A = this chain, B = another copy of it.
Amino acid sequence: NLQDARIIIAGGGIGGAANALALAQKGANVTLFERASEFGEVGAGLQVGPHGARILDSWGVLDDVLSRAFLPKNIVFRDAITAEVLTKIDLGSEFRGRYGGPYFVTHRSDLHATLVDAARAAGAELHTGVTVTDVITEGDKAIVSTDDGRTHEADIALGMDGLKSRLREKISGDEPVSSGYAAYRGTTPYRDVELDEDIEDVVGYIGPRCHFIQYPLRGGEMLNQVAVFESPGFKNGIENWGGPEELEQAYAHCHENVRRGIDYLWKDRWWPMYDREPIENWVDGRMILLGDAAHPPLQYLASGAVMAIEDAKCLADYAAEDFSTGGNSAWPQILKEVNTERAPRCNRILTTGRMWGELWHLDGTARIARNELFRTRDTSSYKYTDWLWGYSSDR
């Protein structure tokens, strides 16, 4: 356990919250600073495969998250032009047996609140409206600066300040890499969505230069919808690219079931999709980058928040194992071993995820090939998914 340990976490998204929870459950003294004046997340869906669900269960929060989640029976891929089913991933008891938990979907806001509440309950000291302005390592401590003029001492600090991380600048000068794709979301009362057939699955329509995803939330009462498309504005240097004037033309070539979806999306806000090139080293002295600060992906594998959750589990587990015997002096080795375990995993998600989205967005003969590949696969095989959903950091 981590009783005598002190950890400061810079950032209170899903990542920082999950780390606060995992560390406080080991008995660590955890202080978390969040920039925003309240804890919160977007009131729309995310997907959490068994690689995240098993970890939530270990922390004792999965039952509760599920009480407010939805349990899809399958992930279903459809052609966005014809609406034809291409393939399904069965998320039933064999899936759950194999991977040690369910594949679920829920509101980001609910998952985030659940984590924050559990971290507090476990002893974490969370602070809102506080920005971490610097982290340095001096001797055997991290020294953390905040925007109220204070400095704080801890054993280690976690840089969990997201895609636009400034703490990352201590290690890398890279900038976010634009995908040229933009994401829109919507949640609609389920019954207000014009549906030809009801939805109890995660449905992904994949088409030339676009996709469209639907899934139920909150026990089937709401439908989450997500539209991702290639922005022509981006290729022309528009700074504020991907705006809603692009949506109608971006989908004009798709099936009516996809085109009807667009009307339900929120149009006041969107998410231009960026990632970063993979980096191996996430550690600067007694600071480690985790979550999107270390490994921000494009969302094709629906695993960014899951990776941040995995990060928490690995950090807490490896530290509790080694700090007990080696104390504070052991922290740099612990960070190194966490980085060595996590980088190959997460960097494969970044890179493979780019290829996976490309595979979705093919046109022409390439689309013909992709459709037939999906149709004819051995659905009993897990070779395309075991690397993702079957990973564990357990040593």
A residues in contact (CB < 8 Å) with B: 355, 358-359, 362, 364-366, 368-370, 372-373, 376-378
User: In the bound complex, how far is the Cα of B372 from the Cα of A372, in angstroms?
Assistant: 10
Shortest distance in angstroms between A47's beta carbon and chain B's nearest beta carbon?
A: 22
The copy count of this chain in the complex is 2
Which 6 residue pairs across A and B have the least CB separation, nearest first? A366-B366, A358-B365, A373-B373, A369-B370, A369-B369, A359-B365
Q: Which chain B positions have C-beta within 8 A of A359?
A: 365, 368-369
Q: In the complex, which residues of chain B have a beta carbon less than 8 angstroms from the beta carbon of A364?
A: 358
CB distance from A239 to the nearest CB of B (A): 28
Contacts of A362 in B (CB 8 A): 365-366, 369
Measured CA separation A365–B373 after assembly (Å):
13
Main secondary structure of the interface of A (DSSP, over half): helix
Q: How far, in Å, is A234 (CB) from chain B's closest CB?
A: 19
23 A-B Cβ contacts within 8 A? A355-B365, A355-B368, A358-B364, A358-B365, A359-B365, A359-B368, A359-B369, A362-B365, A362-B366, A362-B369, A365-B366, A366-B366, A366-B369, A366-B370, A369-B369, A369-B370, A369-B373, A372-B373, A373-B373, A373-B376, A376-B376, A376-B377, A376-B378
Q: Which residues in B have their C-beta under 8 angstroms from that of A355?
A: 365, 368
Closest chain B residue to A370, Cβ basis: B369
Residues of B within 8 Å of A376, CB to CB, are: 373, 376-378
Q: Report Cα–Cα, A364/B366, bound state, in Å.
A: 10
Contacts of A368 in B (CB 8 A): 355, 359
A372: B residues at CB distance < 8 A: 373
Chain B residue with the shortest CB-CB distance to A377: B376
Rounded to whole angstroms, the CA-CA distance of A365 and B355 in the bound complex is 6
Bound Cα distance A141, B368 (Å): 48
Closest B-chain residue to A355, C-beta based? Answer: B365
Q: Which residue of B lies closest to A358 (CB)?
A: B365
Report Cα–Cα, A370/B369, bound state, in Å: 6
- Kindly list 10 other residue pairs between chains A and B, CB separation below 8 angstroms, not including A359-B368, A359-B369, A362-B365: A355-B368, A362-B369, A366-B366, A366-B370, A369-B370, A372-B373, A373-B373, A373-B376, A376-B376, A376-B378
Q: Bound complex: CA of A376 vs CA of B369, how far in Å?
A: 12
Q: Which residues of B have CB within 8 Å of A377?
A: 376
Separation of A152 and B240 alpha carbons in the complex (Å): 75
A370 to B365, alpha carbons, bound, how many Å? 10
| Chain B, residue nearest A359 (CB) | B365
Closest to A364 in B: B358
Q: CB-nearest residue of chain B relative to A361?
A: B365
CA distance A369 to B369 in the complex (A): 7
Q: In the complex, which residues of chain B have a beta carbon less than 8 angstroms from the beta carbon of A370?
A: 366, 369
Question: In the complex, which residue of chain B has the Cβ closest to the Cβ of A354?
Answer: B365
CB-based nearest B residue for A365: B358
* Closest B residue to A362 using CB positions: B366
Closest to A366 in B: B366
Q: Tell me, in angstroms, the Cα distance from A355 to B364 when the chains sit together.
A: 9
Instruction: Say how far A135's CB is from chain B's closest CB, in angstroms.
Output: 39
A368 to B362, CA, bound (A): 12
Q: How far is the CA of A378 from the CA of B378 in the complex (A)?
A: 10
Bound-complex Cα distance A175 to B364 (A): 24
A370-B376 Cα distance, complex, nearest whole Å = 13
Nearest Cβ distance between residue A246 and chain B, in whole angstroms? 23
CA–CA, A369 and B377, complex, Å = 12
